[PDB]
Amino acid sequence: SWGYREHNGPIHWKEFFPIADGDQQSPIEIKTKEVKYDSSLRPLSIKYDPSSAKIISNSGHSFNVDFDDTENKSVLRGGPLTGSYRLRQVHLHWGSADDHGSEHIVDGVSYAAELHVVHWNSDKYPSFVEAAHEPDGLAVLGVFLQIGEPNSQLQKITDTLDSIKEKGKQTRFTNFDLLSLLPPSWDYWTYPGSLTVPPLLESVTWIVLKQPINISSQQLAKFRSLLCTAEGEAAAFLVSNHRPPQPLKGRKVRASFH
Numbered sequence: 291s292w293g294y295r296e297h298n299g300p301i302h303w304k305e306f307f308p309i310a311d312g313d314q315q316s317p318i319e320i321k322t323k324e325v326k327y328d329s330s331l332r333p334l335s336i337k338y339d340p341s342s343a344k345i346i347s348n349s350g351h352s353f354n355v356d357f358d359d360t361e362n363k364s365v366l367r368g369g370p371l372t373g374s375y376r377l378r379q380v381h382l383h384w385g386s387a388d389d390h391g392s393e394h395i396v397d398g399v400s401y402a403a404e405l406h407v408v409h410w411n412s413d414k415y416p417s418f419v420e421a422a423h424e425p426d427g428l429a430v431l432g433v434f435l436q437i438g439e440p441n442s443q444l445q446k447i448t449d450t451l452d453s454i455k456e457k458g459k460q461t462r463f464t465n466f467d468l469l470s471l472l473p474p475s476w477d478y479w480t481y482p483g484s485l486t487v488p489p490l491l492e493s494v495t496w497i498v499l500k501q502p503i504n505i506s507s508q509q510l511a512k513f514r515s516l517l518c519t520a521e522g523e524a525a526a527f528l529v530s531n532h533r534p535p536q537p538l539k540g541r542k543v544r545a546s547f548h
């Protein structure tokens with residue numbers, strides 16, 4: 291029963307998941323003057339199939355779009371990665387205020403929100419659950435959102451949120467243009483880190499895009515009316531679901547660009 295409320299939020303997760311204080315925890319502050327440009331980093335290359343999307347649900351912690359992941363139809367390759375990382379799910383983090391919702395921050399600055407696209411190393415591991423337990427097992431693409439013109443694929447998401455208000459509810463969700471929630475510039479920073487929710491496993495190669503996309507305030511506000519509580523529980527709202535930046539512990543953040 292972890293969450294983001296006073297009694298169960300990020301500062302308390304260590305009481306139940308001691309890896310919360312680990313060597314490679316996420317999110318982090320990206321400090322661009324300590325960032326190392328690296329010419330061995332490949333550009334990202336992304337295959338994606340809009341029919342791969344299957345459903346959206348309320349986890350109680352965010353919404354999740356899950357995708358069929360039995361084939362290599364939607365994959366992330368290149369970047370810092372060796373081999374092919376199969377798309378598993380997409381979700382979003384925000385805060386209670388439009389100007390402070392992202393998980394990662396860049397030189398002191400937070401964004402309105404931050405989209406996570408989660409993939410697993412199917413070249414090496416048999417399942418997402420098993421990859422999540424290996425240092426090279428997961429690759430998560432992070433995209434910042436700033437307040438601006440409404441994104442139509444974000445609108446496709448927000449239009450479902452009344453149908454998944456309570457924790458555990460879900461609904462059909464396919465023909466999802468995920469590539470259109472990426473910015474035009476695919477420059478990125480990368481570092482080794484973890485899930486930003488319990489179990490906080492240090493299995494993530496983070497790939498955070500420099501350029502934000504746009505969401506409207508109205509679109510962003512709709513996420514805050516999702517519940518973190520289930521049908522016939524006393525209602526609590528998911529108004530904020532971002533973890534604070536965690537100690538870097540000397541890890542190297544590399545850039546694809548200079």
Ligand SMILES: NS(=O)(=O)c1c(F)c(F)c(S(=O)(=O)CCO)c(NCc2ccccc2)c1F
Nearest residue numbers: 349351352354406408422430484485486487489
């Ligand atoms: N920010 S993150 O990429 O580290 C993240 C979430 F934000 C998140 F909300 C979730 S979720 O568990 O709350 C959605 C549940 O359906 C997971 N999933 C965590 C996880 C990953 C691998 C193995 C076990 C749990 C998750 F991995």
Ligand SMILES: [Zn+2]
Nearest residue numbers: 381383406486
């Ligand atoms: Zn996330």
